[PDB]
RNA sequence: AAUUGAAGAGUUUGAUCAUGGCUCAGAUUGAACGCUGGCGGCAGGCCUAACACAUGCAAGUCGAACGGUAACAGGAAGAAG
RNA sequence: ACGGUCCAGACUCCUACGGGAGGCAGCAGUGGGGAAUAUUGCACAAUGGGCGCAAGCCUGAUGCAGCCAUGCCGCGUGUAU
RNA sequence: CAGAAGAAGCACCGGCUAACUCCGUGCCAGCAGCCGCGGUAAUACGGAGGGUGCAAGCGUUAAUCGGAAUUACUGGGCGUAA
């Protein structure tokens, strides 16, 4: 149900940083990102059209670390949304409490982040929570375990949070370790390099 | 020290085991089980040359009449310590066996096996070919690979000389620039560790091998 | 009953000792003498030594009826020795006393020659054949007479004169039999002193339960004398459960772990099925002995043995032809159950929790092979079925279908064994079969050599190949001798391929052909016309040619056998090995028994160990080994050829 | 507010366009089978023989309708060690 | 008129041979058939039903438990370096 | 409270269809939904390394609808293709 493979192998076929590490040391200089995985990773073949798809929805639910059939359920919930599709599964992900703590800057990877929410190390509006897939509404505040505020991984966590860039929709507090999900993440907000056209025409097919 | 019986040797041994309990349910004659017996001991004494406590206290067993099959297995496995397992080759010498065979590959072989077979044997199903390994009497490891039929009949063995599955095997003698070559062959079992098991004598194989040649 | 009052005993004889008689008798007379008495009818026939040997192990104790006139007969020899390698305590009922002839001292005389065994007279009886009307009691010093022809007034009187001298006699050989066994007793007799019944009775259980000593009683169970003398000795002298020594079993989690199953019923569950029956009325009966704790009617268990959960619906308990329900079963009780569908014979069965497995009765391998061929295909289905049921009623009767031949071979432990199985496949599943030996395999070979040329004409192939006949067990040669590309080296092995397949399909009655030397020296091909195939089909043409010129002959296996017999059997051994095409090679004394090394062909060797036993009574052994193969005789081979070809 | 909805591809020819059948990519299941198998919540579970059914259980209740007392648990009375 | 009556029939069963008994497509379960489908569980605590003035009694309805990856959903099998 | 301890497999990689080479085999053994592949340099067979897709599941089979405007009401046609 989780993927425990090497991470940055992931990366590599993408051909794009996703993200998976810390970012202490760059991602050039502990992987060659250039080269896809495997032994003919470095022949380059031309993608197909149903190739160009497919990887723009790995790409996703690589960085997003969330399984085909949630992933799937979730583009249904977008779909059943009004509004657009694309833009409304990426917002339903981003709503999830794992990316919620990563963009805090609790956990430094995504995967850590995860490992902080499973072993109920974060609260959020005062009541533990355990589960990844949790969407963190408006106004929620999410703040981290009082007996979680002395691990150190938290702390050095908040450092590596402040060499990326911040977030307008979440405000944190340092030291405190308490932050408030003002609004939704706008599609602007979001990362441009994410195609959501293509991840919508792969479930239509 | 232990007696270094050879493989066929511990496997004659089991059989005549076999035969002398057999011989005491069968025979309803005193006289005849105890000439049985004396053979039996004899035999084994024989098979053994010097006899430790533990062969005496198993023979000593074997010749009552109130040996179990138990206690046979027992004794079967006190006698397969004594029993040495089949020499297996470096890699590097396996490619010195079969030099015209490029990049041969041997499967992993059981101890046991080793221990219970006189020659190791494996067949290559895709090439229909069936590489036998033997350490001659001089203790040269000797290796042939020949053609086994897909056909299979049940007839007696000649490796074995005991009826079984069996399929023609041929040696091909070296081709010559005419491309004269001579094949000989006669059915031997499909399963050379059945084969092993089966074969009570050295010298039965080595002829067998001769004969080939 | 409590489990001292116990008694479960097994009734073991010869062919025609008046077993089953006996059997009834003490039906008629029964429970006896506030015990419990379980009888285990044990079969006489040698073929069926299976049936005595499960029964000996599930019973604590056995009575040896023995016919009067004849004594000890091979039969009693063999069951003795099975019951001796189980160490089942025994007494020894002579039987037929009024069958004229009868010998009671020729028949104790007998146990002792035959079996040595340590067996002294405890009665002596008065008169013989029609004149058999009392017995002496050696232990009480009292005479029993039988005034009626039931044999339900029994007059207890004084020994007679002429009698009360052999009683004395006799006591005295019965003390000291008695005494070697007992140091108690052994005092007492070489002090002359005076030894109570009741310790002469516990000093005889005591020996009997050890197996050192054989309680010798005589009786007719036609004129219903001395089974009830038989019933008292049973309760005197037969251990009960509590005496025996618990069996032992293991662990099914543990094999290493030995676990000791006393007969106590607060103990836990565990019981011993060793026979299965098909009963019209209640269905599957399964036999079982409960050697610890108690089993209740309704209640769930576990086979240990297949490790399988099975529940029992209903408990019956066996009495004569009536038959009765209980409840409960207890430990030391023989009893059967109904609703174990899974539970066959030397499974174990214990409690849900219990993992004890006890020892299971081991199989013999057949001994002798036949095979079975059905009439009609719609019977071949009803036989497979048949074949199985038999099978899962007896694990020693083997049935397989035959591969290659598409024949169904039968194994058993005898002739009988086997044509009881064929008649009730026959009467109960009404399945019509043809048996017969199994047929020996076979091989072909050249008896001369021939050079053949098989051509095949576009398509074009052209082959001379001359055969040879190779030596003995020299096998199959063959000699690529083209020279100049006569043929195309490309197909040479098309030109292989076609004899190998030809010759594995045989030449006359369609056997593997072996010891030939094909040599292929000249051919011809066309350059557009030549293809794989037509060179394979031009080299099975080449040997349907050489078949007609080679003189082709069948060969049947040799085997070498080794004779072990006394020297006063070896003439009928030779003469039956000669009888069978057999050749003696050589004979050598060995002791007192005498050694004939000779090679007889296969096919004759199918039931040898019958006819050994018969020439030899049953001192006769043979080991045979695979020599070589010989050209079959004229005749034979014809027959061979016919049988194939469908002629 | 109760909408948001609509993908083709391979295969007839030397090659082509059309026609036309065949095949595949999806979803779904009371499923079955093979290989494999950590936990939890929730739901489902004889489609076949409307085949035959061992055994227990699934329909009783009312003494406030009535004669009674078979019990039993008492009471009273009378005899009692 | 599932766990009522009568008759006839097929089946199974009892019998003193005269005459009798029975109906799981209620629950659990067995045999059989089939590629294939669960324990002869616990409780009437709640809901609902029958009878009762009520207490209560009865309730395989029902509430629950057992078995099964059969499905749906969530989670894990570490995570940084 | 102790300790990463106790917890990953299945199918697929000629094109359709995301995922490739090597070795063995030699119209054989085999594979296959379709098209087809295999006769000694097989990304199609079998195995290995590597990869792709899914994941306590993964394939296969059966069954229904879709793609099929291929019964066309929505929404097809009838000179020569029916
Ligand atoms: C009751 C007893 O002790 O033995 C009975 C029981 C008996 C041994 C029977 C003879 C024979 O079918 C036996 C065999 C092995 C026959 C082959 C199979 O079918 C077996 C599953 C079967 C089991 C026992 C059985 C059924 C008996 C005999 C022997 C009859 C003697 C002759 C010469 C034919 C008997 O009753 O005398
Ligand atoms: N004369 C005589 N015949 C007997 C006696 N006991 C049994 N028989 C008969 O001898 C035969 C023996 O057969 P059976 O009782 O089946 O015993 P089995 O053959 O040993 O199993 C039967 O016909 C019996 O009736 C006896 O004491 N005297
Ligand atoms: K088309
Ligand atoms: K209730
Ligand atoms: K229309
Ligand atoms: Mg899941
Ligand atoms: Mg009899
Ligand atoms: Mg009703
Ligand atoms: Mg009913
Ligand atoms: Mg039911
Ligand atoms: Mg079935
Ligand atoms: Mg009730
Ligand atoms: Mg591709
Ligand atoms: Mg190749
Ligand atoms: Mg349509
Ligand atoms: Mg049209
Ligand atoms: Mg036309
Ligand atoms: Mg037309
Ligand atoms: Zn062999």
């Known amino acids: 149900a989780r993927y425990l493979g090497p991470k940055l192998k992931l990366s590599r076929r993408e051909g794009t940083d996703l993200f998976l590490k810390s970012g202490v040391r760059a991602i050039d200089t502990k992987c060659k990102i250039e080269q896809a995985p495997g032994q003919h990773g470095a022949r380059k073949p031309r993608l197909s059209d149903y190739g160009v798809q497919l990887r723009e929805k790995q790409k996703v639910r690589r960085i997003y670390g969330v399984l085909e059939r949630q992933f799937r359920n979730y583009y249904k919930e977008a779909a059943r949304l009004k509004g657009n599709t694309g833009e409304n599964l990426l917002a339903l992900l981003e709503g999830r409490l794992d990316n919620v703590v990563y963009r805090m800057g609790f956990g430094a990877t995504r995967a850590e982040a995860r490992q902080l929410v499973s072993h109920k190390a974060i609260m959020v509006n005062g009541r533990v929570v355990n589960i990844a897939s949790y969407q963190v509404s408006p106004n929620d505040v999410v703040s981290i375990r009082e007996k979680a505020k002395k691990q150190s991984r938290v702390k050095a966590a908040l450092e590596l949070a402040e060499q990326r860039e911040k977030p307008t929709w979440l405000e944190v507090d340092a030291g405190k370790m308490e932050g408030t999900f003002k609004r939704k993440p706008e599609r602007s907000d979001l990362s441009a390099d994410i195609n959501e056209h293509l991840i919508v025409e792969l479930y239509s097919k | ?213 | 009953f409590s489990l001292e009052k116990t008694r479960n005993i097994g009734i073991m004889a010869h062919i025609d000792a008046g077993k089953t008689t006996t059997t009834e008798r003490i039906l008629y007379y029964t429970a006896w003498e506030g015990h419990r008495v379980n009888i285990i009818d044990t079969p006489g026939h040698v073929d069926f030594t299976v049936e005595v040997e499960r029964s000996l192990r599930v019973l604590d104790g056995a009575v040896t009826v023995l016919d009067a006139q004849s004594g000890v007969e091979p039969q009693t020899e063999t069951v003795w020795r099975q019951a001796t390698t189980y160490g089942v305590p025994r007494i020894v009922f002579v039987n037929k006393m009024d069958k004229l002839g009868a010998n009671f001292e020729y028949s104790v005389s007998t146990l002792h020659d035959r079996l040595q065994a340590n067996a002294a007279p405890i009665q002596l009886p008065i008169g013989a054949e029609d004149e058999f009307e009392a017995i002496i009691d050696l232990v009480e010093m009292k005479c029993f007479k039988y005034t009626n022809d039931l044999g339900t007034e029994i007059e207890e009187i004084e020994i007679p004169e002429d009698h009360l001298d052999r009683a004395e006699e006799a006591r005295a050989s019965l003390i000291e039999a008695v005494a070697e066994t007992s140091d108690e007793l052994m005092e007492k007799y070489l002090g002359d002193e005076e030894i109570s019944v009741s310790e002469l009775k516990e000093a005889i259980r005591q020996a009997t339960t050890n197996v050192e000593f054989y309680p010798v009683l005589c009786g007719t169970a036609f004129k219903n004398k001395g089974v009830q003398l038989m019933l008292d000795a049973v309760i005197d002298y037969l251990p009960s459960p509590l005496d025996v020594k618990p069996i032992i079993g293991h662990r099914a989690s543990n094999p290493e772990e030995e676990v000791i199953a006393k007969a106590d019923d607060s103990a836990e569950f565990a019981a011993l099925a060793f026979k299965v029956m098909t009963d019209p009325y209640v269905g599957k009966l399964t036999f079982f002995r409960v050697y610890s704790g108690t089993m209740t009617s309704g209640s769930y268990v576990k086979n240990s043995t297949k490790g399988k959960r099975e529940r029992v619906g209903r408990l019956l308990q066996m009495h004569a032809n009536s038959r009765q329900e209980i409840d409960t079963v207890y430990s030391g009780d023989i009893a059967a159950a109904v609703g174990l569908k899974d539970t066959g014979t030397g499974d174990t069965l214990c409690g849900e929790k219990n993992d004890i497995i006890l020892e299971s009765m081991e199989f013999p391998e057949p001994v002798i092979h036949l095979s079975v061929e059905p009439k009609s295909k719609a019977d071949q289905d009803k036989m497979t079925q048949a074949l199985v049921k038999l099978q899962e009623e007896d694990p020693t009767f083997h049935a397989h279908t035959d591969e290659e031949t598409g024949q169904v071979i039968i194994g058993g432990m005898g002739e009988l064994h086997l044509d009881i199985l064929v008649d009730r496949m026959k009467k109960e599943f009404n399945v019509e079969c043809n048996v017969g030996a199994p047929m020996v395999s076979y091989r072909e070979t050249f008896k001369s050599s021939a050079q053949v040329q098989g051509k095949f004409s576009g398509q074009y192939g052209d082959v001379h190949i001359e055969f040879t006949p190779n030596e003995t067990g020299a096998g199959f040669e063959f000699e690529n001798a083209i020279v100049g590309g006569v043929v195309p080296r490309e197909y040479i092995p098309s030109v292989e391929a076609g004899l190998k397949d030809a010759m594995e399909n045989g030449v006359l009655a369609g056997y593997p052909l072996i010891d030939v030397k094909a040599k292929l020296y000249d051919g011809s091909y066309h350059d557009v016309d030549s293809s794989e195939m037509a060179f394979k089909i031009a080299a099975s043409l080449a040997l349907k040619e050489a078949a007609k010129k080679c003189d082709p002959v069948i060969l049947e296996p040799m085997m070498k056998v080794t004779i072990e017999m006394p020297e006063e059997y070896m003439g009928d051994i030779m003469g039956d090995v000669t009888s069978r095409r057999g050749r003696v090679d050589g004979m050598e004394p060995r002791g007192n028994a005498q050694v004939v090394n000779a090679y007889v062909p296969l096919s004759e060797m199918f039931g040898y160990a019958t006819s050994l036993r018969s020439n030899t009574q049953g001192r006769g052994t043979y080991t045979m080994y695979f020599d070589h193969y010989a050209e079959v005789p004229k005749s034979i081979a014809e027959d061979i050829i016919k049988k194939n070809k469908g002629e």
């Open chain 2, 1 to 213: 020290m232990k007696t270094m019986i050879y493989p066929h040797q511990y496997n004659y041994i089991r059989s005549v085991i076999l035969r002398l309990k057999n011989v005491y349910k069968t025979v309803n004659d005193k006289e005849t089980v105890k000439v049985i017996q004396s053979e039996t001991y004899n035999d084994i004494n024989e098979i053994f040359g010097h006899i430790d406590d533990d062969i005496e206290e198993s023979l000593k067993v074997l010749m009552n009449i109130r040996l179990s099959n138990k206690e046979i297995e027992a004794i079967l496995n006190k006698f397969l310590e004594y029993v040495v397992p089949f020499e297996l080759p470096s890699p590097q010498k396996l490619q010195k066996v079969f030099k015209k065979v490029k990049k041969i590959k041997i499967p992993q072989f059981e101890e046991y096996d080793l221990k219970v077979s006189s020659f190791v044997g494996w067949n290559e199903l895709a090439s229909n070919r069936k590489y036998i390994i033997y350490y001659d009497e001089k203790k040269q490891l000797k290796g042939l690979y020949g053609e086994i039929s897909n056909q299979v009949v049940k007839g007696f063995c000649t490796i074995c000389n005991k009826e079984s599955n069996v399929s023609l095997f041929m040696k091909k003698s070296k081709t010559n620039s005419d491309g004269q070559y001579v094949k000989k062959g006669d059915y031997i079992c499909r399963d050379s560790i059945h084969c092993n098991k089966q074969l009570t004598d050295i010298n039965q194989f080595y002829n067998f091998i001769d004969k080939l040649d």
